């Protein structure tokens, strides 16, 4: 399965954060992808962004839909999961269905320091401009 670069995904994606799958919410039948409900447990980018237009439930969990979008190779999880997730608010043409949803927009990554130094990186690079 060809996936983009990290760079170009990095680019895509307005909040990349690191979380647990607690559960696996409802289906959506009309892009045939699941919703699971994070336990975040850190930001690596987009804080600011969930912060102002996600309303939290516990203080430290979201949902996050999208999974087992076809466009995307590492798209499954299961509970107790732990991943680095790349997602993006998502639009109003996807409410109510998903409204307050975070969405998933590149492969899951695993949660290892190599990843997350990288990760941390090319967001830093980026930052600069
Ligand atoms: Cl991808």
Known sequence: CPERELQRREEEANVVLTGTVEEIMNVDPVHHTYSCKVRVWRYLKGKDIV???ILLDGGNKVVIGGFGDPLICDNQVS???????????????????????????????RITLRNLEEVE?????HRKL
Not at 80 to 109: C, K
Not at 121 to 125: D, K, S, T, Y
Request: glycine share 2%; charged share 20%.
């Open 51 to 53: 912060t102002h237009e």
């Open 79 to 109: 509970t107790g999961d732990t991943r680095i997730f790349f997602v993006n608010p998502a639009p109003q043409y996807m409410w109510p269905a998903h409204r307050n949803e975070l969405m998933l927009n590149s492969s899951l990554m």
């Open 121 to 125: 990186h090319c967001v830093e690079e």
